[PDB]
Design an enzyme around this catalytic site. Structure first.
Site, short mmCIF file in Angstrom:
data_model
loop_
_atom_site.label_atom_id
_atom_site.label_comp_id
_atom_site.label_asym_id
_atom_site.label_seq_id
_atom_site.Cartn_x
_atom_site.Cartn_y
_atom_site.Cartn_z
N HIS A 1 6.20 -22.67 1.22
CA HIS A 1 5.99 -24.07 1.63
C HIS A 1 4.73 -24.25 2.50
O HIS A 1 4.80 -24.74 3.63
CB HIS A 1 7.23 -24.61 2.38
CG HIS A 1 8.38 -24.98 1.49
ND1 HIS A 1 9.51 -24.19 1.38
CD2 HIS A 1 8.58 -26.05 0.70
CE1 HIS A 1 10.35 -24.77 0.54
NE2 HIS A 1 9.81 -25.89 0.11
N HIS B 1 0.88 -24.85 -1.74
CA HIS B 1 1.91 -25.74 -2.28
C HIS B 1 1.53 -27.22 -2.20
O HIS B 1 1.64 -27.93 -3.20
CB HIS B 1 3.24 -25.48 -1.54
CG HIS B 1 4.35 -26.39 -1.96
ND1 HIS B 1 4.86 -26.40 -3.24
CD2 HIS B 1 5.06 -27.31 -1.26
CE1 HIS B 1 5.84 -27.29 -3.31
NE2 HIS B 1 5.98 -27.86 -2.12
N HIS C 1 3.53 -33.71 2.37
CA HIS C 1 4.97 -33.79 2.12
C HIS C 1 5.81 -32.64 2.71
O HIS C 1 7.02 -32.80 2.87
CB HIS C 1 5.27 -33.93 0.62
CG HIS C 1 5.34 -32.62 -0.10
ND1 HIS C 1 4.22 -31.86 -0.38
CD2 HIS C 1 6.40 -31.92 -0.57
CE1 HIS C 1 4.59 -30.75 -1.00
NE2 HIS C 1 5.91 -30.76 -1.13
N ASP C 2 5.19 -31.49 2.98
CA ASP C 2 5.84 -30.37 3.69
C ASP C 2 5.13 -29.96 4.98
O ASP C 2 5.27 -28.81 5.41
CB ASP C 2 6.01 -29.16 2.76
CG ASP C 2 7.17 -29.30 1.79
OD1 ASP C 2 8.27 -29.73 2.21
OD2 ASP C 2 6.98 -28.98 0.61
N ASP D 1 7.02 -31.76 -6.99
CA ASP D 1 7.48 -30.70 -6.07
C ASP D 1 7.95 -29.40 -6.76
O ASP D 1 7.89 -28.33 -6.15
CB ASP D 1 8.58 -31.22 -5.13
CG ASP D 1 8.66 -30.46 -3.81
OD1 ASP D 1 7.62 -29.94 -3.35
OD2 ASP D 1 9.75 -30.39 -3.22
N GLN E 1 17.33 -18.69 -12.12
CA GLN E 1 16.28 -19.54 -12.70
C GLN E 1 16.82 -20.31 -13.91
O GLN E 1 16.73 -21.54 -13.95
CB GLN E 1 15.03 -18.74 -13.07
CG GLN E 1 14.33 -18.13 -11.86
CD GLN E 1 13.47 -19.11 -11.08
OE1 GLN E 1 12.55 -19.72 -11.60
NE2 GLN E 1 13.75 -19.23 -9.79
#
Ligand SMILES: O=C1c2cccc3cccc(c23)C(=O)N1CCc1n[nH]c(=S)n1-c1ccccc1
Ligand SMILES: [Mg+2]
Ligand SMILES: [Zn+2]
Length: 322
Positions: A79, A83, A117-118, A228, A280
């Protein structure tokens, strides 16, 4: 309590020019920023200028914002600065392929939102912060880090010579902050599942409508989710390398829970690496495929993201077969 970028950092970004062999390839959804680390701030400048215009923000103010945003992302496995830009790129691509569907203010807001956003992510989830009464969990009881990520964005805007939105009217200034708040809160996966099911039910029954404001938030929410998780829409070897960054962050959070004596979830347990393929395969079927499935139905130009996500699911199915 915000890191201010140096004068050389933002000056060097103003003088940066994007090489011409990249101009062509930044428009493609599958584009991987990874191998051009030195060019990331300039790649965000370029995307802003192409989407909104060369006279959209004041170049001097914009290069302070970007480079101050970079300095407030931490050096954690996933993060992080990489990213932010990767997510901003995916938005650019979406916005470019559905351009007049959105406003100038919406285009302005969502790329700025994706970059922030992070902001100031600690490598820890919402559930971790709430369980061990962290101060931030006391401040924001739901969507914990995402509210903080908006609160961090607003602080950078409020720094000296950083407020790129200054030149908007005070009406448009509060419109675009609600766009940014809403878009950053939507990046919490806890909300995605509610958001997507609604949009499918809205889509299938014919009641989905883009001039309807309540629906714009839901469609923007899905786009913010789509972006995202865009690591699942890159070429197979790239998606496999980004997966390792993610699990490294989950496993550090595992170790902290094991120190206090608590069995974590399998996804955050480094001893359960065997199951990752099944993890996954699950994530793609329960989250990713449904996300881009509903996105491509609303915005048919965003199909390459669905195609790449499917192509990677195949690869995850081949992984389990040995
Ligand atoms: O949690 C994320 C996740 C969160 C946010 C952004 C992501 C982007 C790419 C891949 C993943 C994520 C990803 O792969 N996983 C989950 C993968 C996983 N590993 N083990 C188990 S279980 N799962 C899983 C999580 C949710 C649904 C199904 C499986
Ligand atoms: Mg987040
Ligand atoms: Zn994110």
């Amino acid at each position: 309590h915000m890191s201010i970028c140096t004068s050389e950092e933002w000056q060097g970004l103003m003088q940066f020019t994007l090489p011409v062999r990249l101009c062509k390839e930044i428009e493609l959804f599958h584009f991987d920023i990874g191998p051009f680390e030195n060019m990331w701030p300039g790649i965000f400048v370029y995307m802003v200028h192409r989407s909104c215009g060369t006279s959209c923000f004041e170049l001097e103010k914009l290069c302070r914002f970007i480079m101050s945003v970079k300095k407030n992302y931490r050096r954690v496995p996933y993060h992080n600065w990489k990213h932010a830009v990767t997510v901003a790129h995916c938005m650019y691509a979406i916005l470019q392929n559905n351009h007049t569907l959105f406003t100038d203010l919406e285009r302005k807001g969502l790329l700025i939102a994706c970059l922030c956003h992070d902001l100031d992510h600690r490598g820890f989830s919402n559930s971790y912060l709430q369980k061990f009464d962290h101060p931030l969990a006391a401040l924001y009881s739901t969507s914990t880090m995402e509210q903080h990520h908006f609160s961090q964005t607003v602080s950078i805007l409020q720094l000296e010579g950083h407020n790129i939105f200054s030149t908007l009217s005070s009406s448009e200034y509060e419109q675009v902050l609600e766009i940014i708040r809403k878009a950053i809160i939507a990046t919490d996966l806890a909300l995605y599942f509610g958001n997507r099911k609604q949009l499918e039910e809205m889509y299938q029954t014919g009641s989905l409508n883009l001039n309807n404001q309540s629906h714009r938030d839901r469609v923007i929410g899905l786009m913010m989710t789509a972006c995202d998780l865009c690591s699942v829409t890159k070429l197979w070897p790239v998606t496999k390398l980004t997966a390792n960054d993610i699990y490294a962050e989950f496993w550090a959070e595992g170790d902290e829970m094991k120190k206090l004596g608590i069995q974590p979830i399998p996804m955050m347990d480094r001893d359960k690496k065997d199951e990752v393929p099944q993890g996954q395969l699950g994530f793609y079927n329960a989250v990713a495929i449904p996300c881009y499935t509903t996105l491509t139905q609303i915005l048919p130009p965003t199909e390459p993201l669905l195609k790449a996500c499917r192509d990677n699911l195949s690869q995850w199915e081949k992984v389990i077969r040995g």
